C-alpha cells in the first residue's frame, strides 16, 4: 500500500484571520506579504497532488483492452479486472477496498477536487492490467505485442533463472496456486489500510485544530472581533485586534510550516509509487525485496482513495 | 551498422532543433528563489503596527522610551519574516538535495554502466546516456532502443518430434503458416529448429499446447 | 454561456459532447481549450486512444525493425 | 540429469581446484558421431 496524494486544500488567509471585519482588514494590511505567501504555498501544494497522481498512473498512452474470451492457460483474473455490472467500474477488490477506507467549507477554508477522477483512475488501472496480461512488459517499451500467457509467464520463469520447461511441465499446479493466493487477498481486505487512513486522520487533525484556534484570546479581552468592537472604542479596540491577528497569523503559519513538511512526505512516496509501476507493474525487477518478497514474477496495481495498492 | 549510425546521427540533430525552438524545471528553480527574496526585501517596508517602517524616523520623532515599544514592534515583524524565509529555504534545500541524489544516481546508473531498471534512464530499453551541464542543474541525454514495426505470427510452447518434447534455448517458436522457424524475441530473425537451438524434457503428454515437428540434428548428414 | 460542474460554475465558455487530450485543466475531469468561429470551449479529457490487443492462446507479434531514439531528462 | 560435455566445459588439470571430486563425463555427441 502506498500513499500518492492528499485533499487539495486551500484557506482564505483574510477571511480566516478577519470576518466581516473592515478595521480588522485595514489592520492586517500592515504586516504586509504574509497572506499572498500563505496562498502561493497552499496552491503550490494543490497543484502537486494532481502531478503526483500523473506520474503514478498516467504511464500508458493507449487505453488497452481484454479480449472477450478470457482465456489465460488456467490463470483467473476475474478479482482484479473491472465489472461492467455497476456504474463505478472498479474490480472487486477495488470496491472492497474503496468501502474500507472511512466537507468543511466553513470560515474561508475550501476543499478543490482532484483533476482525475476516481473512475479515471480506475480506468488507467485497468489499462495497466490489460496491458501487462496480453504483452507482458513490452507495452512499456514500446507497442503492445501480444503472447499467449502462458508463454509470458515462461519468460518470467527464466528471469529468475528457473528453465521453461519446469512452467509447462507443472502448468496446471502453477495455475491453481496462483488463482488460490488471489481468493485470500479477498478474505484478507474483506475481514488494514492504515497507510492511506492515517493520511486521512492527519489531515482532518490540522483542520479542526486550525478552527479550534479562531475561539483562542490570544490575550485579547474576547476571542470575537465584533464584541470587541462594539465594546471599545478605537484607540482600544485596535490593539485587542491587533491581538488576534497576531495569534491567527501565528496559527496559520504553523498549519502551513506543518502543510509543506507533510507534502514532501507524500512526494517522497509518489516517486516511490511511480518507481513501483514503473519496474514492478511494467517489466520485471531483478532488485531482492523491492517488488515484495520471494522472486518477483510480476505486480497488479490497483487503485485506493489517495493511494496504490500493488498486489505483487 | 550504417543504418544504425544513420538513425543515431539524425536523432541528435532533432535535439538541436528542440532546445532551440524546455527548461522549466532550472528556470522555476531560479523564478522561486528570486521571489523569495523581494518578498524578504518588501517586508522591510510593512509597519507591524508601527507609527512608521523607518527606525531613523522612529527616533527622530520619538524619545528613548517611547522609541523602543515603537522598534520592538519592527524588529518582532523583521524577525517574523527571516523566519519564515529560513524556513521555507531550507524546506526548498531538501527538494533539490533529492533532485541531486536522483542526478547522481542516474550518473552512475544511466551514464555509467546501462540499465535494467524499466523507464529508468528513459522510455524503450535502455542503450546508454550522456550528461550535459545547464546552470544548477544537469541534462541526460538518454539514448535508447525501441522495437518498430511488428508482424502476427502463430506459435507454439515446445515441438513434439521422437515423442520427446523440444523447447527452445534462447527464442520462440513460430510460423509463417507452412513451416516452424526457431526465432530470438525481440528482434525477427528466423531459423529452423535444431538441437543446437533446443532441449529435451520429458514425452509429448504433459505440455498444454504442443505441435508436431521435425528437429534437424545436423549432424546426420555428416555420417556420409 | 453558462456551464456548472463539480469544480464550479463556469462563464463565458462552451461546453461539447467531444473529448480530447486536457489542454487546460479545470478540476474533476473537465478540461478547456481554444477551438473553433475560434472560442472557449470545456470538455471531458479522454485518457487516450482504445486498443483492444489481438490476444489468442497460440498468437505472437515480433518486432521486424527497430528505432533508435534520443530523449532529453 | 547425467554429466555430460554439454552439460560441462574443462580448464586444465584437476589439481587446480581446491576441492574435486573424481566421475565419468558420458560425452554424448560421440555416440551421435558413432
Not at chain 1, 278 to 293: A, I, P
Amino acid at each position: 500500500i502506498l500513499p500518492v496524494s492528499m485533499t487539495k486544500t486551500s484557506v482564505d488567509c483574510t477571511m480566516y484571520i478577519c470576518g466581516d471585519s473592515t478595521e480588522c482588514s485595514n489592520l492586517l494590511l500592515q504586516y504586509g506579504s504574509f497572506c499572498t505567501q500563505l496562498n502561493r504555498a497552499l496552491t503550490g501544494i494543490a497543484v502537486e497532488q494532481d502531478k503526483n497522481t500523473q506520474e503514478v498512473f498516467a504511464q500508458v498512452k493507449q487505453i488497452y483492452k481484454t479480449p472477450p474470451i478470457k482465456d489465460f492457460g488456467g490463470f483467473n483474473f476475474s478479482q482484479i479486472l473491472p465489472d461492467p455490472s455497476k456504474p463505478s467500474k472498479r474490480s472487486f477488490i477495488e470496491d472492497l477496498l474503496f468501502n474500507k477506507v472511512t466537507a468543511q467549507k466553513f470560515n474561508g477554508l475550501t476543499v478543490l477536487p482532484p483533476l482525475l477522477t476516481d473512475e479515471m483512475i480506475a480506468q488507467y488501472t485497468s489499462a495497466l492490467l490489460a496491458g501487462t496480461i496480453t504483452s507482458g512488459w513490452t507495452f512499456g517499451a514500446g507497442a503492445a505485442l501480444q503472447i499467449p500467457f502462458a508463454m509470458q509467464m515462461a519468460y518470467r520463469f527464466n528471469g529468475i533463472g528457473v528453465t521453461q520447461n519446469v512452467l509447462y511441465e507443472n502448468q496446471k499446479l502453477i495455475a491453481n496456486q496462483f488463482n488460490s493466493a488471489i481468493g485470500k487477498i479477498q478474505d484478507s481486505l474483506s475481514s488494514a489500510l492504515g497507510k492511506l487512513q492515517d493520511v486521512v486522520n492527519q489531515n482532518a487533525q490540522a483542520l479542526n485544530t486550525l478552527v479550534k484556534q479562531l475561539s483562542s484570546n490570544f490575550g485579547a479581552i474576547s476571542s470575537v472581533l465584533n464584541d470587541i468592537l462594539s465594546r471599545l472604542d478605537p484607540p482600544e479596540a485596535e490593539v485587542q485586534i491587533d491581538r488576534l491577528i497576531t495569534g491567527r497569523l501565528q496559527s496559520l503559519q504553523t498549519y502551513v510550516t506543518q502543510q509543506l513538511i507533510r507534502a514532501a512526505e507524500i512526494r517522497a512516496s509518489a516517486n516511490l509509487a511511480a518507481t513501483k509501476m514503473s519496474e514492478c507493474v511494467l517489466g520485471q525487477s531483478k532488485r531482492v525485496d523491492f517488488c515484495g518478497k520471494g522472486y518477483h514474477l510480476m505486480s497488479f496495481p490497483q487503485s485506493a482513495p489517495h493511494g496504490v495498492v500493488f498486489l505483487h | 551498422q550504417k543504418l544504425i549510425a544513420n538513425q543515431f546521427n539524425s536523432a541528435i540533430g532533432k535535439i538541436q532543433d528542440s532546445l532551440s525552438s524546455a527548461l522549466g524545471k532550472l528556470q522555476d528553480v531560479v523564478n522561486q528563489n528570486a521571489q523569495a527574496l523581494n518578498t524578504l526585501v518588501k517586508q522591510l517596508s510593512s509597519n507591524f503596527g508601527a507609527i512608521s517602517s523607518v527606525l531613523n524616523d522612529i527616533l527622530s520623532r520619538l524619545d528613548p522610551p517611547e522609541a523602543e515599544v515603537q522598534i520592538d514592534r519592527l524588529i518582532t515583524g523583521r524577525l517574523q519574516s527571516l523566519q519564515t524565509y529560513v524556513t521555507q529555504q531550507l524546506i526548498r534545500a531538501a527538494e533539490i538535495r533529492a533532485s541531486a541524489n536522483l542526478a547522481a544516481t542516474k550518473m552512475s546508473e544511466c551514464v555509467l554502466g546501462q540499465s535494467k531498471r524499466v523507464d529508468f534512464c528513459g522510455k524503450g530499453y535502455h542503450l546508454m546516456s550522456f550528461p550535459q551541464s545547464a546552470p544548477h542543474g544537469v541534462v541526460f541525454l538518454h539514448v535508447t532502443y525501441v522495437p518498430a514495426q511488428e508482424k502476427n505470427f502463430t506459435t507454439a510452447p515446445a515441438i513434439c518430434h521422437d515423442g520427446k518434447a523440444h523447447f527452445p534455448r534462447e527464442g520462440v517458436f513460430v510460423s509463417n503458416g507452412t513451416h516452424w522457424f526457431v526465432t530470438q524475441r525481440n528482434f525477427y530473425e528466423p531459423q529452423i529448429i535444431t538441437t543446437d537451438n533446443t532441449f529435451v524434457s520429458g514425452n509429448c503428454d504433459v505440455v498444454i499446447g504442443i505441435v508436431n515437428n521435425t528437429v534437424y540434428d545436423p549432424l546426420q548428414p555428416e555420417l556420409d | 454561456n453558462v456551464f456548472q460542474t463539480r469544480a464550479g460554475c463556469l462563464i463565458g465558455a462552451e461546453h461539447v459532447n467531444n473529448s480530447y487530450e486536457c489542454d487546460i485543466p479545470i478540476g474533476a475531469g473537465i478540461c478547456a481549450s481554444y477551438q473553433t468561429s475560434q472560442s472557449i470551449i470545456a470538455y471531458t479529457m479522454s485518457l487516450g486512444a482504445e486498443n483492444s490487443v489481438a490476444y489468442s492462446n497460440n498468437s505472437i507479434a515480433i518486432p521486424t525493425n527497430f528505432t533508435i531514439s534520443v530523449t532529453t531528462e
